[PDB]
């Protein structure tokens, strides 16, 4: 699917063209060589050159293999580890952990197979590669590289860049995305421009596997658009009542459940809450993974403030919200209680699927009744949700100073491994089938604003999955300079 003409289109620029990037681009090693994800293959790859440096990039390896390991199989994968990088003989020996390290984790080894074994070795390792080797890597060619793919990334991006079919297209790479697109005219009459930018901004600064990213900020003549992520699956409304009996199984319901809390911490981690969470606005993806969608009702909470804002959706409203008082993050914990009730039981906890009730007494019932369980839920579910789902937002799980931590250990999640879960290593329960369908100068001012342009980590991702990083990412034979990254001629 892509354009014909796009390796011309994504040529890199001579490095000349780079300077000012250079001179401006902040020389951080956790964020050009880990965060943003072109800079982190261009960086493993320098090591890749240096043979004292190669034996580092294969040691992480393996310590991320290592937390995601299954439990039983832990102590196993130690001792591969170990004999392999921790044993002065190898060849592969990651000598700057220190003697007294490795001697200290042949102790945690003979003792209990933790996920966190090597916790203190990476660490090790990454303040040594902080040191001598990124700054060789910041006079080497895979930086000026790197510089040559930022100067790409910070294109402009127009109506062209797209091919919309709303669910736009990348032509140049063949990516697909959906585009919320805002008609102007609509947001001035109705005053919208803080709410559009306040949107516009959770979007792109959140990034997380279970929330949808923007990718695209642009403006054109006749709208202001969003490209966020795209997602095929339907939404969970759909599965609970024309997919499942009405309601999933509990195990299913799990699942869904983990993936929706890790997208809550995500945006917990930026202090936004959310406090739109209801079936309909989790979406599934092609994998059957999920992400929270329609951030339009989000908001930042200024770190150690409050605020006010009776918004959200009749019977998904927490009592804080109900009786407009100062809250921060703990509407998203009664949502999660919502959520986790209606999946397992098949209805809201204060409004039977059967029932014809008003607004009146379902927001009487969120404010006073105890919501009640039946057979389908175990004990631990009950005792999750009946936590989740207390009136009191200072007693409420997850609304204390721990934060989601305290919801990972609940016994409801006794048997969930999040650290496999968040690297996408357990198979969700459902897969969607590929073929299924489930003019002031103010105005301007707020426009610039807007039309930021491409996002950067989720535009170098787009970069890696099309395939046009492999493709592109191309030197000279045998460690040469190629013509592009050569000052003598360009």
Same mark, same amino acid.
């Given at each position: 699917?892509?354009?014909?003409?796009?390796?011309?289109?994504?040529?890199?620029?001579?490095?000349?063209?780079?300077?000012?990037?250079?001179?401006?681009?902040? +020389?951080?090693?956790?964020?050009?060589?880990?965060?943003?994800?072109?800079?982190?293959?261009?960086?493993?790859?320098?090591?890749?050159? +240096?043979?004292?440096?190669?034996?580092?990039?294969?040691?992480?390896?393996?310590?991320?293999?290592?937390?995601?390991?299954?439990?039983?199989?832990?102590?196993?994968?130690?001792?591969?580890?170990?004999?392999? =990088?921790?044993?002065?003989?190898?060849? %592969?020996?990651?000598?700057? %952990?220190?003697?007294?390290?490795?001697?200290?984790?042949?102790?945690?080894?003979?003792?209990?197979?933790?996920?966190?074994?090597?916790?203190?070795?990476?660490?090790?390792?990454?303040?040594?590669?902080?040191?001598?080797?990124?700054?060789? =890597?910041?006079?080497?060619?895979?930086?000026?590289?790197?510089?040559?793919?930022?100067?790409?990334?910070?294109?402009?991006?127009?109506?062209?860049?797209?091919?919309?079919?709303?669910?736009?297209?990348?032509?140049?790479?063949?990516?697909?995305?959906?585009?919320? +697109?805002?008609?102007?005219?609509?947001?001035?009459?109705?005053?919208?421009?803080?709410?559009?930018?306040?949107?516009?901004?959770?979007?792109?600064?959140?990034?997380?596997?279970?929330?949808?990213?923007?990718?695209?900020?642009?403006?054109?003549?006749?709208?202001?658009?969003?490209?966020?992520?795209?997602?095929?699956?339907?939404?969970?409304?759909?599965?609970?009542?024309?997919?499942?009996?009405?309601?999933?199984?509990?195990?299913?319901?799990?699942?869904?459940?983990?993936?929706?809390?890790?997208?809550?911490?995500?945006?917990?981690?930026?202090?936004? %809450?959310?406090?739109?969470?209801?079936?309909?606005?989790?979406?599934?993806?092609?994998?059957?993974?999920?992400?929270?969608?329609?951030?339009?009702?989000? %908001?930042?909470?200024?770190?150690?403030?409050?605020?006010?804002?009776?918004?959200?959706?009749?019977?998904?409203?927490?009592?804080?919200?109900?009786?407009?008082?100062?809250?921060?993050?703990?509407?998203?914990?009664?949502?999660?209680?919502?959520?986790?009730?209606?999946?397992?039981?098949?209805?809201?906890?204060?409004?039977?699927?059967?029932?014809?009730?008003?607004?009146?007494?379902?927001?009487?019932?969120?404010?006073?009744?105890?919501?009640?369980?039946?057979?389908?839920?175990?004990?631990?579910?009950?005792?999750?949700?009946?936590?989740?789902?207390?009136?009191?937002?200072?007693?409420?799980?997850?609304?204390?100073?721990?934060?989601?931590?305290?919801?990972?250990?609940?016994?409801?999640?006794?048997?969930?491994?999040?650290?496999?879960?968040?690297?996408?290593?357990?198979?969700?329960?459902?897969?969607?089938?590929?073929?299924?369908?489930?003019?002031?100068?103010?105005?301007?001012?707020? =426009?610039?604003?807007?039309?930021?342009?491409?996002?950067?980590?989720?535009?170098?991702?787009?970069?890696?999955?099309?395939?046009?990083?492999?493709?592109?990412?191309?030197?000279?034979?045998?460690?040469?300079?190629?013509?592009?990254?050569?000052?003598?001629?360009?």
């Amino acid at each position: 699917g892509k354009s014909k003409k796009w390796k011309e289109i994504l040529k890199f620029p001579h490095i000349s063209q780079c300077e000012d990037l250079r001179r401006t681009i902040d +020389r951080d090693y956790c964020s050009l060589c880990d965060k943003q994800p072109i800079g982190r293959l261009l960086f493993r790859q320098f090591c890749e050159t +240096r043979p004292g440096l190669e034996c580092y990039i294969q040691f992480l390896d393996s310590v991320a293999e290592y937390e995601v390991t299954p439990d039983e199989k832990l102590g196993e994968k130690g001792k591969e580890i170990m004999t392999k =990088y921790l044993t002065p003989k190898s060849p %592969v020996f990651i000598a700057q %952990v220190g003697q007294d390290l490795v001697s200290q984790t042949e102790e945690k080894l003979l003792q209990k197979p933790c996920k966190e074994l090597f916790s203190a070795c990476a660490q090790s390792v990454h303040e040594y590669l902080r040191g001598e080797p990124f700054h060789e =890597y910041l006079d080497s060619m895979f930086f000026d590289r790197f510089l040559q793919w930022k100067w790409l990334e910070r294109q402009p991006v127009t109506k062209n860049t797209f091919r919309q079919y709303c669910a736009c297209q990348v032509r140049a790479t063949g990516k697909m995305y959906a585009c919320k +697109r805002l008609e102007k005219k609509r947001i001035k009459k109705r005053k919208g421009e803080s709410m559009a930018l306040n949107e516009k901004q959770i979007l792109e600064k959140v990034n997380s596997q279970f929330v949808v990213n923007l990718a695209y900020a642009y403006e054109t003549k006749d709208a202001l658009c969003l490209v966020l992520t795209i997602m095929n699956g339907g939404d969970l409304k759909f599965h609970i009542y024309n997919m499942g009996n009405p309601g999933f199984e509990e195990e299913r319901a799990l699942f869904y459940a983990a993936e929706i809390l890790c997208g809550l911490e995500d945006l917990h981690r930026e202090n936004t %809450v959310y406090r739109n969470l209801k079936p309909e606005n989790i979406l599934l993806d092609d994998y059957g993974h999920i992400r929270i969608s329609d951030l339009g009702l989000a %908001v930042k909470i200024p770190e150690g403030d409050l605020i006010r804002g009776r918004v959200g959706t009749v019977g998904y409203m927490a009592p804080e919200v109900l009786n407009n008082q100062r809250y921060g993050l703990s509407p998203d914990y009664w949502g999660l209680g919502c959520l986790i009730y209606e999946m397992i039981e098949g209805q809201s906890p204060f409004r039977g699927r059967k029932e014809k009730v008003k607004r009146e007494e379902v927001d009487r019932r969120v404010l006073e009744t105890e919501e009640v369980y039946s057979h389908k839920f175990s004990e631990e579910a009950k005792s999750i949700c009946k936590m989740l789902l207390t009136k009191d937002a200072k007693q409420r799980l997850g609304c204390q100073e721990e934060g989601a931590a305290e919801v990972k250990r609940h016994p409801f999640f006794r048997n969930m491994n999040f650290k496999r879960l968040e690297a996408g290593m357990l198979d969700p329960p459902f897969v969607p089938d590929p073929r299924a369908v489930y003019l002031d100068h103010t105005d301007d001012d707020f =426009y610039s604003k807007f039309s930021t342009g491409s996002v950067s980590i989720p535009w170098q991702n787009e970069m890696i999955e099309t395939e046009c990083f492999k493709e592109l990412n191309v030197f000279g034979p045998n460690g040469t300079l190629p013509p592009d990254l050569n000052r003598n001629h360009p």
